[PDB]
Amino acid sequence: AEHLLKPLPADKQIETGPFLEAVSHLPPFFDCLGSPVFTPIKADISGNITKIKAVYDTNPAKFRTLQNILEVEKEMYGAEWPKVGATLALMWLKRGLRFIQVFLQSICDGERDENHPNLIRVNATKAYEMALKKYHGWIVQKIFQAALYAAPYKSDFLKALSKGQNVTEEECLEKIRLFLVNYTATIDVIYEMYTQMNAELNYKV
Numbered sequence: 001a002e003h004l005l006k007p008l009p010a011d012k013q014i015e016t017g018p019f020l021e022a023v024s025h026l027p028p029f030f031d032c033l034g035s036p037v038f039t040p041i042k043a044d045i046s047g048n049i050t051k052i053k054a055v056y057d058t059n060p061a062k063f064r065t066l067q068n069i070l071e072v073e074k075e076m077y078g079a080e081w082p083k084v085g086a087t088l089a090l091m092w093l094k095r096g097l098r099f100i101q102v103f104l105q106s107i108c109d110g111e112r113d114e115n116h117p118n119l120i121r122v123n124a125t126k127a128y129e130m131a132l133k134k135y136h137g138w139i140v141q142k143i144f145q146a147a148l149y150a151a152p153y154k155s156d157f158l159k160a161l162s163k164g165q166n167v168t169e170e171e172c173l174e175k176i177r178l179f180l181v182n183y184t185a186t187i188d189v190i191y192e193m194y195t196q197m198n199a200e201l202n203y204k205v
Helices: 016-023 027-033 036-058 066-080 085-108 121-131 138-149 154-161 169-196
Strands: none
Touching: 016 036, 016 066, 027 036, 027 154, 036 066, 036 085, 036 138, 066 085, 066 169, 085 121, 085 154, 085 169, 121 138, 154 169
């Protein structure tokens, strides 16, 4: 959470390069959940970032913003778009990013089960339901939900999130709150872009 995203400009265009740089630091979030069950999603999210970067690197100016990626790929691929290329990679990436956002916001806001205040089950469930659940077939849902149920104690989770740096739990939460400002605004704009451009696809894996 130390690698802040750029603030949104007035025109709400998101520059591809700085976005990819920032979100490249995020897949280790999944390691903090303490289950091998999250290794595939970590790899999938990393693969989405790699794919968007591969397209961007072929012509960074043509793909300068995320909006440019969608509009250029729509021209390139015709009727095959939006189920193609970096557009499809980003369609999936944003769901993993939203998962992280909702999870972290919920923890930072003090949301908890008062019967089990040192667990993060309720925060995990909220994040999963809001971001990913409907895109998973039932078999996947059961295993993914079981691993979230088996998440670390909240204090251990926060210790994992701040590994290395010498920070208190309170300082860790403060830093996450700061990170959440531009992160949330950016993910919201990406979701709105998918809606506006008719690039969203609702299918299960």
